[PDB]
Design a protein around this ligand. Structure first.
Ligand SMILES: O=C(O)CC[C@H](O)C(=O)O
Ligand SMILES: [Cl-]
Ligand SMILES: [Mn+2]
Ligand SMILES: [Zn+2]
Ligand SMILES: [Zn+2]
Length: 452
């Protein structure tokens, strides 16, 4: 009746030994956790990264949030103290109770009541920003003079600053600017502040640590059910599914998990408490809301497990005409070009993706030659700003190749949209390519040698 909580997602309590290597652990829980999309990880009892910051010197500008189910929201001044004061007073007055007296079950039930009730117009506020000098990681980082406890945690795989640039990770090697994606984000929550249903850019993993404060309630959907969810959502809120002019205009919304569950989309929940991690798996839809004043930190990452999905995702983006954050092929080639220093399991996995890339590229080039594109010239795509190498048609970031015509200087189409560049006959076109097929096979061989 009214709200029936989804079943609980998996909770893991790894031993210190399991905990020692986050990517090993994540790979271990994956068979379980990918069936639920999200999972919760409680570190060993004594893993306690020290949090320390001055609540008066940390400033941020909060996002205002209206709480209306199915209403469109776009995906992307207080001190921490003054936000906290506002946040505690709001929750306190909302329930006419002390903050720790309010049951999580009640806040949840009430959240889903208020977002579906037209007459209620509750607005809340929240902080979401990347780690910067004005607002840094809640984890220890090298710079100033650090206490021995902070140095214990400096190099932790679970220190979310390290997670991106570890070597079982794939996003580390990217030389392109993807700041929004490899740098941790800080989230300052208050009661009912929420994050709308979404999946990560390029279907990456995400990992979220709640440093302190009241819990964060999560809903997650396994990756296999992503399209199922999107279909449900498209029916109830087609506005969200219109073409978006860029990445800064992605539309997202609050939606009751019971709605999803009614439509046979599997949904799981959890209350993430302070000191606990939540991990989201590739293409796993998730949303939730904060129970009260709190402070979280999250970052995207990509394992070798993810590489084929990363390629599928970019294909999926092309079909949708969605902008890419980075070129997946450029990342693959960058890694190939560093085959000798790559981890060996990484090298082996990159090699397999590269082989598909090359075979696809071979077929695409044969096709455009048969269309009468004859002229060609090598081109260092990675030197162009992203906005100068997006396919006119499908907006994909070009790297392996593109078609240009002197008729339209600067414009490019990918080899899927040769027909979409201009009205000139194909013999006026140039195939611009990063590598000849003959360049590519030795790059792949280097990987094979490294993998042995
Ligand atoms: O905590 C928020 O406000 C959003 C969390 C984000 O979706 C994540 O992947 O950690
Ligand atoms: Cl409402
Ligand atoms: Mn997320
Ligand atoms: Zn295209
Ligand atoms: Zn032309």
């Amino acid at each position: 009746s009214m709200f029936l909580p989804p079943p609980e997602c998996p909770v893991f309590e790894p031993s210190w030994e399991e905990f020692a290597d986050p990517f090993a652990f994540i790979h271990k829980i994956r068979p379980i956790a990918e069936q639920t999309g999200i999972c919760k990880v409680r570190p060993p009892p004594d893993w306690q990264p020290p949090f320390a910051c001055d609540v008066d010197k940390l400033h941020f500008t909060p996002r205002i949030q209206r709480l209306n189910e199915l209403e469109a929201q776009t995906r992307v001044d207080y001190t921490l103290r003054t936000f906290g004061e506002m946040a505690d007073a709001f929750k306190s007055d909302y329930f006419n109770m002390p903050v720790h007296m309010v049951p999580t079950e009640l806040v949840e039930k009430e959240f889903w009541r208020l977002v579906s009730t037209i007459e209620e117009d509750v607005t809340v506020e929240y902080g979401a920003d990347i780690a910067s000098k004005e607002f840094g990681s809640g984890f220890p980082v090298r710079d100033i003079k650090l206490s021995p406890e902070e140095e214990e945690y400096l190099d932790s795989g679970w220190n979310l600053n390290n997670m991106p640039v570890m070597e079982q990770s794939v996003l580390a090697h990217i030389t392109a600017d993807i700041c929004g994606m490899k740098l941790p984000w800080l989230y300052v929550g208050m009661c009912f502040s929420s994050f709308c249903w979404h999946i990560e850019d390029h279907w990456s993993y995400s990992i979220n640590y709640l440093h302190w404060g009241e819990p964060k309630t999560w809903y997650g959907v396994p990756g296999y059910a992503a399209e199922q969810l999107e279909n449900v959502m498209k029916k109830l809120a087609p506005e969200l599914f219109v073409s978006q002019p860029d990445l800064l205009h992605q539309l997202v919304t609050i939606m009751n998990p019971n709605t999803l569950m009614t439509h046979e989309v599997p949904v799981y929940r959890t209350n993430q408490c302070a000191g606990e991690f939540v991990i989201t798996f590739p293409r796993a839809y998730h949303s939730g809301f904060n129970q009260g004043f709190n402070f979280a930190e999250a970052v995207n990452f990509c394992t070798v497990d993810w590489l084929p999905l990363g390629r599928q995702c970019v294909e999926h983006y092309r079909l949708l005409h969605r902008y890419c954050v980075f070129s997946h092929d450029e990342m693959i080639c960058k890694m190939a070009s560093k085959a000798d220093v790559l981890d060996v399991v990484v090298a082996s996995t990159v090699q397999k993706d590269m082989a598909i890339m090359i075979e696809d590229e071979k077929a695409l080039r044969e096709t455009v030659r048969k269309l009468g594109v004859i002229d060609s010239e090598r081109m260092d795509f990675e030197l162009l700003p992203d906005d100068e190498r997006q396919c006119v048609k499908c907006k994909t970031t070009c790297f392996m190749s593109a078609i240009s015509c002197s008729c339209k200087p600067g414009l490019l189409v990918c080899l899927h949209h040769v027909k979409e560049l201009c009205s000139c006959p194909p013999y006026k076109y140039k195939l611009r390519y990063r590598y000849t097929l003959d360049d590519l096979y030795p790059m792949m061989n280097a990987l094979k040698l490294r993998a042995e």
